[PDB]
Coordinates of C-alpha atoms and ligand atoms in Angstrom, one line a residue:
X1 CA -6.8 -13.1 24.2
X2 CA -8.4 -12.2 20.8
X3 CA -5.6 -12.6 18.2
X4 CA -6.1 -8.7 17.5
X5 CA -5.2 -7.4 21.1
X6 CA -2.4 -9.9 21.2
X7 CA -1.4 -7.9 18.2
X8 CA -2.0 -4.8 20.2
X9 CA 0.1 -5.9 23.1
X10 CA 2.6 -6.2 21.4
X11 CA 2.7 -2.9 19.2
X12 CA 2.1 -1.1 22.7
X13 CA 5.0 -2.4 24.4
X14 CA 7.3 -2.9 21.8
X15 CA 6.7 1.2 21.4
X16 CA 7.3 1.2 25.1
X17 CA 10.4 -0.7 25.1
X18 CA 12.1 1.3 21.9
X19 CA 11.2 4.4 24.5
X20 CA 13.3 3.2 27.2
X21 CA 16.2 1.4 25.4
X22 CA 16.5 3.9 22.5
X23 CA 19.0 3.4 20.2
X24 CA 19.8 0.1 22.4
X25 CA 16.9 -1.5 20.4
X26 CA 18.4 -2.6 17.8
X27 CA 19.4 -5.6 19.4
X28 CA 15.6 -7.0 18.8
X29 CA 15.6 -5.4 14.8
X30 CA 16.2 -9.3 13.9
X31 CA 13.0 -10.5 15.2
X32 CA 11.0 -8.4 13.3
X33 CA 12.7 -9.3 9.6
X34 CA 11.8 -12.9 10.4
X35 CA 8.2 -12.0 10.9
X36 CA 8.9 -10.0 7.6
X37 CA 10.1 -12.4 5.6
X38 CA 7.9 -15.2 6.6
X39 CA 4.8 -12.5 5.4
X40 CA 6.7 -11.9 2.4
X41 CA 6.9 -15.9 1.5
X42 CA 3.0 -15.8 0.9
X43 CA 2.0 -13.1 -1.1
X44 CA 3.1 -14.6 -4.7
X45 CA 1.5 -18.0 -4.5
X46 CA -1.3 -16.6 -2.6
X47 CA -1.5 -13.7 -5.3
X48 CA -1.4 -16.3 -8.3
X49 CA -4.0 -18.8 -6.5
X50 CA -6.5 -16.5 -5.4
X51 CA -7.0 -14.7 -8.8
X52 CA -7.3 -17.8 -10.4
X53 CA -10.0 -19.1 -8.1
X54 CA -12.0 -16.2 -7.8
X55 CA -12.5 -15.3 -11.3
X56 CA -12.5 -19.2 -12.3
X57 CA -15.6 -19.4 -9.4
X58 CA -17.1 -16.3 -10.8
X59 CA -17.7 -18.3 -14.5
X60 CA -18.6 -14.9 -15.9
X61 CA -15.9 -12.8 -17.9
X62 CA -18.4 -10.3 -18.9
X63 CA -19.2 -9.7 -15.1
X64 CA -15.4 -9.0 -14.8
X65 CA -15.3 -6.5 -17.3
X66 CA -17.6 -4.5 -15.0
X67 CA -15.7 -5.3 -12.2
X68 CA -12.5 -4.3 -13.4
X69 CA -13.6 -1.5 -15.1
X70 CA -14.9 0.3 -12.1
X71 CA -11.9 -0.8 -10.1
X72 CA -9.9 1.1 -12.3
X73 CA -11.4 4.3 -12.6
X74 CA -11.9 4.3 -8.6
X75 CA -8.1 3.7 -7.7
X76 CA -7.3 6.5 -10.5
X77 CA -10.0 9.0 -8.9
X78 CA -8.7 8.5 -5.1
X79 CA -5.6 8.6 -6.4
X80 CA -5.5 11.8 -7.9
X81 CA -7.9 12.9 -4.8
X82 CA -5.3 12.2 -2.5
X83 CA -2.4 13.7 -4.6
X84 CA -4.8 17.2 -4.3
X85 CA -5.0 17.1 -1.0
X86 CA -1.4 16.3 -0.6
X87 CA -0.5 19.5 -2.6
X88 CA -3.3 21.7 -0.7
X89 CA -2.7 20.5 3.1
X90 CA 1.3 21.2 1.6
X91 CA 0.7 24.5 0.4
X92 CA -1.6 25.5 3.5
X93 CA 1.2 24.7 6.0
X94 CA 4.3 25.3 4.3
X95 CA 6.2 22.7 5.7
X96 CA 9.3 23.4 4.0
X97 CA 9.4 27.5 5.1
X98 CA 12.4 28.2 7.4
X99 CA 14.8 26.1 6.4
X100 CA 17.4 25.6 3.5
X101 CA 20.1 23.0 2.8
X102 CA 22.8 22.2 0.7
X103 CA 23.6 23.6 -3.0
X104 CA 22.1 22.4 -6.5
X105 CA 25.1 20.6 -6.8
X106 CA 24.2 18.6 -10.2
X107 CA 22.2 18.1 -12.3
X108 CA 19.3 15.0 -11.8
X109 CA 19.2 11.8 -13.4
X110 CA 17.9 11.6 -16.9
X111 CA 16.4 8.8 -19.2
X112 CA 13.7 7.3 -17.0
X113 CA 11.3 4.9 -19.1
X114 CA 9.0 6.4 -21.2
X115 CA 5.1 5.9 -19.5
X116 CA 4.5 3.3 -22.8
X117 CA 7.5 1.1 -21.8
X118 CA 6.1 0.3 -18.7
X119 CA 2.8 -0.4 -19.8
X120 CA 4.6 -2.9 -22.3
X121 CA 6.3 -4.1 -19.1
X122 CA 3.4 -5.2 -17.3
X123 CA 2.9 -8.6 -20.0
X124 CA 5.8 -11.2 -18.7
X125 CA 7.9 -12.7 -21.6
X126 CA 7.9 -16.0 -19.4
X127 CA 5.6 -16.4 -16.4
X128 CA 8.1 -18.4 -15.0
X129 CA 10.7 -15.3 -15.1
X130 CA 8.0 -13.2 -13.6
X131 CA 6.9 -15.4 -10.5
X132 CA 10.8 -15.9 -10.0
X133 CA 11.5 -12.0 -10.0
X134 CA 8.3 -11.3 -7.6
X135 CA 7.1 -9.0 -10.6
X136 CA 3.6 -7.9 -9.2
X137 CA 2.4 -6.9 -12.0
X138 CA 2.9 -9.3 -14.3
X139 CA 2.3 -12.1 -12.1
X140 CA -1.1 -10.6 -11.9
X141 CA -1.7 -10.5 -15.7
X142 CA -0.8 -13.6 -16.3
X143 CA -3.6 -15.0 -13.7
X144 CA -6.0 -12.3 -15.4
X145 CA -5.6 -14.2 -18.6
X146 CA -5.0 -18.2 -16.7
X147 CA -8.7 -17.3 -14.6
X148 CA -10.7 -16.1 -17.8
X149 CA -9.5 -19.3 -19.4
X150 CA -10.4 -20.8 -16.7
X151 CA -13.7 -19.4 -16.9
X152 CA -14.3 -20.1 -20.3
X153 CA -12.3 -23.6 -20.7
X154 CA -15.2 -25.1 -18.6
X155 CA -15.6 -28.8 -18.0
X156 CA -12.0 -30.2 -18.5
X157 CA -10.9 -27.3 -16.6
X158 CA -11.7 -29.1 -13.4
X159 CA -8.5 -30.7 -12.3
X160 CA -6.4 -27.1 -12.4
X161 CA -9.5 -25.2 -11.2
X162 CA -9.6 -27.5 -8.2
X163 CA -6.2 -27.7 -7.4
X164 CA -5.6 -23.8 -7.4
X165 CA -8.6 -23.5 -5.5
X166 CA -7.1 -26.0 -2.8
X167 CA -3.8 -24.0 -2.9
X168 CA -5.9 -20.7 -2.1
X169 CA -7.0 -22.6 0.9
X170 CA -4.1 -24.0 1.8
X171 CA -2.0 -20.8 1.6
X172 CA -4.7 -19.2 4.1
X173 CA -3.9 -21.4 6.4
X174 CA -0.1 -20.9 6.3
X175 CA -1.0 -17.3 6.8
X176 CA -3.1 -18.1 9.5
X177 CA 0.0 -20.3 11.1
X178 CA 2.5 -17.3 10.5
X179 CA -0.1 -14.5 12.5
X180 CA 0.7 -16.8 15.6
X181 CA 4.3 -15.2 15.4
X182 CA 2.8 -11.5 14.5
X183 CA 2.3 -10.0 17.8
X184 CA 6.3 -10.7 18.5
X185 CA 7.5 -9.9 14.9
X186 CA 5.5 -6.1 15.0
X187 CA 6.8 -5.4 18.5
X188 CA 10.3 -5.7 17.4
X189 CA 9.6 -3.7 14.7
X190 CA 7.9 -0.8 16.8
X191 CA 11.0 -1.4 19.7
X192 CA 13.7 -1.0 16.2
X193 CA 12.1 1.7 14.6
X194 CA 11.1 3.8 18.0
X195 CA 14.2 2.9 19.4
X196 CA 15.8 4.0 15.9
X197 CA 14.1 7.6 15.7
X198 CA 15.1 9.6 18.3
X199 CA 13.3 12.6 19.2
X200 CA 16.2 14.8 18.0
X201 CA 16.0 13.8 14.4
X202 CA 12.6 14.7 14.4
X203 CA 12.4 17.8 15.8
X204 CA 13.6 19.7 12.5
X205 CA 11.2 17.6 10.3
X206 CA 7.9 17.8 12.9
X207 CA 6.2 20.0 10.6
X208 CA 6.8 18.0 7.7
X209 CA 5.7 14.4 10.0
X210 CA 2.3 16.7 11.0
X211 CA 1.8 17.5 7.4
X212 CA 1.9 13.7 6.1
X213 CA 0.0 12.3 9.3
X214 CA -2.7 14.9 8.7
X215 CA -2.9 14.3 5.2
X216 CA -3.3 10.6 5.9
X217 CA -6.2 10.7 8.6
X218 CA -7.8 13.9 6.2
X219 CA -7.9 11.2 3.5
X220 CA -8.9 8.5 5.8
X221 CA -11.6 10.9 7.3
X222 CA -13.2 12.5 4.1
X223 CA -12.6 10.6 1.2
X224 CA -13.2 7.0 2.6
X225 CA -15.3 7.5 5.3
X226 CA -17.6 9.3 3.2
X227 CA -17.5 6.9 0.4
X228 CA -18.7 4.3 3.3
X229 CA -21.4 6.2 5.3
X230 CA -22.8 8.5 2.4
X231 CA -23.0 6.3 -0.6
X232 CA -22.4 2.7 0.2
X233 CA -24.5 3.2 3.4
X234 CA -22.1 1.4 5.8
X235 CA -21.7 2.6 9.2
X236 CA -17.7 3.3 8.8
X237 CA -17.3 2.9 12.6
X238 CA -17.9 -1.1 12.3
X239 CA -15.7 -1.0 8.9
X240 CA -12.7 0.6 10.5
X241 CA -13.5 -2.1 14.0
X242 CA -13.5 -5.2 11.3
X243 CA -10.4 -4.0 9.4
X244 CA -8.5 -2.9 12.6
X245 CA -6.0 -5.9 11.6
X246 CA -4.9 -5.1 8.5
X247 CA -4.8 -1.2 9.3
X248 CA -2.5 -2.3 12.0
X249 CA -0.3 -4.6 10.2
X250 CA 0.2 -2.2 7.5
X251 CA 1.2 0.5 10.0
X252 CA 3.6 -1.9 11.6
X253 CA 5.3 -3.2 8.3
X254 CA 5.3 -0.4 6.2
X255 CA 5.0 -3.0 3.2
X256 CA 1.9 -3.4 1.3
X257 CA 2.8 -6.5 -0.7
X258 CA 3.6 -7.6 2.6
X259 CA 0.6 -6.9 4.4
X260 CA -1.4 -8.6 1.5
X261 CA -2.0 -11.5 3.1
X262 CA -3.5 -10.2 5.8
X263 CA -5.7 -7.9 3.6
X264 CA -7.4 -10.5 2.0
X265 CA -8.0 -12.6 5.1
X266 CA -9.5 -9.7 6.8
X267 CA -11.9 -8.8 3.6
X268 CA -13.4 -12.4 4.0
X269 CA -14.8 -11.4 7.0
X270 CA -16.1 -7.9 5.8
X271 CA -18.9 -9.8 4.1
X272 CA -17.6 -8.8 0.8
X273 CA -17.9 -12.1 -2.1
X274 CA -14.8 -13.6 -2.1
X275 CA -14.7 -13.7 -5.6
X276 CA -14.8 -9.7 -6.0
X277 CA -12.3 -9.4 -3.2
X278 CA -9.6 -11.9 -4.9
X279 CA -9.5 -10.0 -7.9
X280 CA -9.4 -6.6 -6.3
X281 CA -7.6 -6.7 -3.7
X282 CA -3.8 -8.0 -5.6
X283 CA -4.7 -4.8 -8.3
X284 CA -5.2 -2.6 -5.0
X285 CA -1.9 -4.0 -3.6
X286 CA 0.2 -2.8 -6.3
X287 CA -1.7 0.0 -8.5
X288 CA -3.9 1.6 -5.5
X289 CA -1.4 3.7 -3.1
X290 CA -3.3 7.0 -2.8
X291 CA -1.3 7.1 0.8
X292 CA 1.8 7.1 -1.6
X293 CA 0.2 9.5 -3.9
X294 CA -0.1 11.9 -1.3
X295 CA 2.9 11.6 0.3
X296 CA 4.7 12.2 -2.7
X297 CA 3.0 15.3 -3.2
X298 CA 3.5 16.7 0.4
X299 CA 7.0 16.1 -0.2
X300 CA 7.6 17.7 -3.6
X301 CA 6.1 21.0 -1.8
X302 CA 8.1 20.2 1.2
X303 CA 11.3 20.3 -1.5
X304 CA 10.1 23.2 -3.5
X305 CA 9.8 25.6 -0.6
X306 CA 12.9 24.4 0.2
X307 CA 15.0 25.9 -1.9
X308 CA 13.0 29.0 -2.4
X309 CA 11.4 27.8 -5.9
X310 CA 7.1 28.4 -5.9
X311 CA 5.3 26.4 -7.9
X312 CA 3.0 28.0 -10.7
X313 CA -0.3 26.3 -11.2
X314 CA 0.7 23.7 -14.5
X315 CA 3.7 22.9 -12.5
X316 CA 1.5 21.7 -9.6
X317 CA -0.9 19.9 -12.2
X318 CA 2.0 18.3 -13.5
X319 CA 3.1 17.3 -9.9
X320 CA -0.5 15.5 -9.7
X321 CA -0.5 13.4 -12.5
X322 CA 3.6 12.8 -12.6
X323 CA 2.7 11.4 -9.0
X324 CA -0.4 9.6 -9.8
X325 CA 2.1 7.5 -12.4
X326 CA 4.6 7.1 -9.7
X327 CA 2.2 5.5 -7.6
X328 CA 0.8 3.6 -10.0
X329 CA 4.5 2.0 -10.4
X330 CA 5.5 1.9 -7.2
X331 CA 6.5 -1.5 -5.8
X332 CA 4.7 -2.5 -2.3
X333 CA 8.2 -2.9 -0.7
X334 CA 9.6 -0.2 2.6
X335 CA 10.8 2.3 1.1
X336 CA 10.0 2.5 -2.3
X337 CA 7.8 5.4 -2.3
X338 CA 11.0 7.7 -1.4
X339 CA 12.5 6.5 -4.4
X340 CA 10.3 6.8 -7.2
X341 CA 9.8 10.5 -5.7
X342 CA 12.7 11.2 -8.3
X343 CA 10.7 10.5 -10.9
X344 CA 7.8 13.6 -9.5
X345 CA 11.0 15.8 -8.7
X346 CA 12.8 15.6 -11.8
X347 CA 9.6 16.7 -13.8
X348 CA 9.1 19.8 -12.2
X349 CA 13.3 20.5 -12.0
X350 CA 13.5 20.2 -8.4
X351 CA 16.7 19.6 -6.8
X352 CA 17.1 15.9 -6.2
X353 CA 19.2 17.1 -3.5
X354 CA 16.0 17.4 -1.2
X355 CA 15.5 13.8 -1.2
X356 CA 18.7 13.5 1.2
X357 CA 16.0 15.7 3.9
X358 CA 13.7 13.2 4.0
X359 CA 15.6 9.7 3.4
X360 CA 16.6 10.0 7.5
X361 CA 12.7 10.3 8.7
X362 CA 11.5 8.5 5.7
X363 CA 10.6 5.3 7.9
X364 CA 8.1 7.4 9.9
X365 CA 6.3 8.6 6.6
X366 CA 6.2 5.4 5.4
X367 CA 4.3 3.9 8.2
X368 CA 1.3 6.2 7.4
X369 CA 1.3 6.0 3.7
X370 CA 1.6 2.3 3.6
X371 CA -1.6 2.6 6.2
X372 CA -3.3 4.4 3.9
X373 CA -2.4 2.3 0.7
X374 CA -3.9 -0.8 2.6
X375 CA -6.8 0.9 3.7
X376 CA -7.3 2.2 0.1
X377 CA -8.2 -1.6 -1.4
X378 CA -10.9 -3.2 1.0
X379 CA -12.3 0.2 0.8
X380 CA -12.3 -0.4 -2.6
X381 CA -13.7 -4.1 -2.4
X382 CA -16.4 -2.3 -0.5
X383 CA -17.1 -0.1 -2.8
X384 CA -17.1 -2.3 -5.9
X385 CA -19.2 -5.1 -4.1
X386 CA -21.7 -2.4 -2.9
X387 CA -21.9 -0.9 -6.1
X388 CA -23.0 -5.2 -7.5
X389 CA -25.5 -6.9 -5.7
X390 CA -23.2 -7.3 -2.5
Ligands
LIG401 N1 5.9 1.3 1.7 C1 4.7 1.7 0.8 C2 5.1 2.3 -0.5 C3 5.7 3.7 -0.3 O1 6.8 3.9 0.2 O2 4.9 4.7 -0.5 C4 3.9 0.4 0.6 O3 4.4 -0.7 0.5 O4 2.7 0.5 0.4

């Protein structure tokens, strides 16, 4: 009766029905964009609130530089980890061997922004424009610099720090009225997509599906459950059991930004402050997708081998950070990580034409990956909290 197993119910037998009906279970796909959407309708204004409370509650900017600081330098380090193992669990199994498709018909797109526009990108002209777009990013700079006034502003910053910190609450608890409808929203989502994917389409891409599920619980395995049980000394077995929701929801929705609500209403009961967690856990959202870094990487090998090209050792390095920076811009929406895998393929010179392979399966892929992105930031929070006095 626990909300989790209701969850669980519902994932099993939504995976059962998409079994029988097949292709049938369409029918249901609308269900599960409702419970979609009505995620979605959160995340902004419960982005916006909850970095301005937390690091309005914290009252310390200098503490923040810490904070922040080591964030940083974490996401960047698992997500070039993950990127490496991408490219080694790629290279060990070859997953694109045995096949070839297709000519180099043309050539790829040119003129993507240069890596300093997009840095320039991240400060909004008008926050207004930026909460109206759903720009992540910028949304999330502007409540950097609104909660450090905060901060600082001090006694007649009462009324606004109040009322943001009654919105926090109050957008919680709308979350916590939408979960009622999750268990039926994720088991029309497992009945569309299982329904969806035949085993047929698979079949030619299993090695490729092994690769990136392997690749995911390696990560998930060695790089954060080490990080838990060797250095912050906490027994990952009760970590995974407390975050089972979020791990879940991820997997279900495939959409990070998405699954952010449910993220930071898990991480209050990790034991983690809440004001660490509110800052970390939006950056995470949006910057942190070493799941996305590795798929990428697995699937610039996957393209390489097949069209006969092999890889010399700077093109691989140049594979690792080009996908670190597409991960870093990738937008927590379905799908996205597919697309910006352009931008790895076109600075090696791989065909583009490789990305029609995987945009059929690409659903599958982004189950795991998204999985992995969510787990990434309250493994983080962990971390960072751990790493203050917790
Ligand atoms: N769907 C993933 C992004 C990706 O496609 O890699 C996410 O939202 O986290």
């Amino acid at each position: 009766m626990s909300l989790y197993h209701k969850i669980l119910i519902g994932f099993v037998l939504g995976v059962i029905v998409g079994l029988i009906f097949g292709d049938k279970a369409e029918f249901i796909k609308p269900l599960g964009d409702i419970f979609l959407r009505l995620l979605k309708m959160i995340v902004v204004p419960l982005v916006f609130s909850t970095i301005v409370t937390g690091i309005a509650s914290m009252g310390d900017v200098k503490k923040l530089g810490r904070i922040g600081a080591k964030t940083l330098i974490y996401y960047m380090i698992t997500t070039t980890l993950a990127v490496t193992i991408g490219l080694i669990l790629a290279n060990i199994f070859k997953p694109g061997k045995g096949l070839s498709l297709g000519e180099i018909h043309e050539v790829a797109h040119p003129n993507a922004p240069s890596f300093t526009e997009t840095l320039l990108n991240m400060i909004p002209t008008n926050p207004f424009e930026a909460m109206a777009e759903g720009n992540m990013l910028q949304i999330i700079v502007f409540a950097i610099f609104f909660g450090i006034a905060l901060a600082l502003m001090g006694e007649k910053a009462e009324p606004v720090k109040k009322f943001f910190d009654s919105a926090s609450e109050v957008m919680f608890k709308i979350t916590d009225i939408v979960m009622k409808f999750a268990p039926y929203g994720v088991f029309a989502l497992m009945a569309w997509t299982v329904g969806k994917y035949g085993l047929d389409v698979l079949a030619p891409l299993g090695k490729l599906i092994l690769t990136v599920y392997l690749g995911c619980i390696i990560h998930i395995l060695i790089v954060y459950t080490l990080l838990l049980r060797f250095l912050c000394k906490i027994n990952p077995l009760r970590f995974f059991k407390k975050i089972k929701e979020a791990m879940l929801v991820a997997f279900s929705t495939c959409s990070s930004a998405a699954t952010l609500p449910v993220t930071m209403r898990v991480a209050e009961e990790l034991g983690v402050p809440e004001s660490i967690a509110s800052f970390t856990l939006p950056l995470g959202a949006t910057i942190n997708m070493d799941g996305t870094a590795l798929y990428q990487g697995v699937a610039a090998i996957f393209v390489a081998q097949a069209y006969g090209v092999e890889l010399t050792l700077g093109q691989q390095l140049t594979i690792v950070l080009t996908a670190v920076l597409a991960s870093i811009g990738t937008a927590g929406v379905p799908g996205a990580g597919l697309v910006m895998l352009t931008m790895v393929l076109t600075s090696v010179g791989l065909p583009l034409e490789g990305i029609a392979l995987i945009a059929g399966i690409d659903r599958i892929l982004d189950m795991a990956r998204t999985t992995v992105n969510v787990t990434g930031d309250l493994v983080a929070t962990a971390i960072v909290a751990r790493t203050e006095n917790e």
